[PDB]
Structure formats: structure tokens, C-alpha cells
Amino acid sequence: GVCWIYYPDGGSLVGEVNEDGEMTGEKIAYVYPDERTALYGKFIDGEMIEGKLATLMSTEEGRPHFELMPGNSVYHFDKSTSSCISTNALLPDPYESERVYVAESLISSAGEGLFSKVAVGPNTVMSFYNGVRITHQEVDSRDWALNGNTLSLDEETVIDVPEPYNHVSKYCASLGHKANHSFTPNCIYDMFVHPRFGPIKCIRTLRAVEADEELTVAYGYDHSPPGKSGPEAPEWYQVELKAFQAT
């Protein structure tokens, strides 16, 4: 027989369980939420040891048939630490590679932005927000110039993409940190359980999005340090809010 285990995010693990009911063997796969792109190979108790890029070609009565992509890119469970963002910082995520790219943002003086490579519908995972894992306290206690890329993961953990990893030449394993802010966003941040990055967030569309459209998310500045005017967000956001409210 064959078991499929679906995560809430749409991704799944599929294969024959061993003598103990564990996802362990040489023919197990993680399948991305597109139900087509796969990481196929050696898993131990659901943990990816050596997954090669594959395509889910067909399914017959729950039994999947995969074809390996040409090449030598192998992926493994490689969860970040407080200091290490990735063992392979320049190894892109293959699902992300087909959906998004980094270019100059169409927003003025907003650096780079994240763009859809293709047309997709609502609720589509486009990009992964991986980074080093730090506490809320450390973020709260340090210089604000250090907190451009600090995304809250849960009540306890923040994912950061600090220097020098905020530059694509130094880090391109995930690209979620390139999406800029909008008050009319076309995406949201959502939870994701990634076979390489582990528990992280992703960028998921809210509506249909056309090819080459900039992907944008509403940032969260409710908990910015209070000033005379309320929570004092970074000044670009303050300006854009005043600008947006005028409409």
C-alpha cells in the first residue's frame, strides 16, 4: 500500500511505510502544494535525507509515479539556527524558482520587490520566507535599523534575513523576504511546513495574479514602539499610510 500525509498548507508526504509504520525508505517523496513538483528519495521517519527534484506524472489508485529531473541538485532537511540561515545559501527552492523572481520594485524608493513569474489563482503558495531563528526579545532590544526583515513566526520566534543574506548574490534559497508592503496587498503571509526549511512562513496569494505582477503583503506594525502619534512605524510606512488614507 501507500500513505499520503497532507499538511494544512497543501504540501504532502507520500510513500510506502516501513515495518513500523514510518515514512522511511528510498522511494518516499515530498510533494509541493501544486501536486506536481516533488522531492523524491531517501527519507527517515518523514525527514528528508536525500530528495531529488522530480515530477509527479500520474497517480493510479493512490500509487504515485515520479520522473526525476535531470541534474544533481539534492535537498535535505536543513532547518536554520540562530546563526546559520542555510547549509546551501545559493541553492534555490525549485517550486519557488518557477513562480517568482526578484526585480526592482514598482514602488518608488522601496528597493527590490518580488514578482510572479506566471499567472495563478487565489490561495496559491508563491514563495517561502526562511531565515535565521531569533527571539522577539532580541528584536525588541536591538537597533531598529536591524529589523527590516524580521518576520514573526509565532509568539516566541522571529525569522530574520540579516546582512549579508538580504542580498540575492549571497542568499537565494528562499525569496519571501523580497516582497514589499502594500495597503491593498495581493498576498498574505501564511504558515508552511517545508521539507528543507522546516516550520516557516510562506507567501500565499489572496486573489488571482497575472504574470509579472508585483507580489505585496500588508506588513504588521501594530506593535511598533509607541510615540506621541501612537505606534511609531518606520517612516516609509507612516508616509505611505498618510498617502493611502487620502484616497
Ligand SMILES: O=C([C@@H](Cc1cccc(C(F)(F)F)c1)NS(=O)(=O)c1cc(F)c2c(c1)CCNC2)N1CCCC1
Ligand atoms: O510585517 C512585518 C513585521 C514588521 C516588524 C518588524 C519588527 C518589529 C515590528 C514591530 F515593531 F513589532 F511592529 C514590526 N511585523 S511582524 O508581525 O512580523 C513582527 C516582527 C517582529 F520582529 C516583532 C513583532 C512583530 C512583535 C514585536 N516583537 C518583534 N514584516 C517584517 C518582514 C516583512 C514583513
Ligand SMILES: C[S@@+](CC[C@H](N)C(=O)[O-])C[C@H]1O[C@@H](n2cnc3c(N)ncnc32)[C@H](O)[C@@H]1O
Ligand atoms: C522584507 S524587506 C522587502 C524587500 C526590500 N525592498 C529589499 O530590497 O530587500 C522590507 C523593507 O523593504 C522596504 N519596503 C517594503 N515595502 C515598502 C514600501 N511600500 N515603501 C517603501 N519601502 C518599502 C523597507 O525598506 C523595508 O524595511
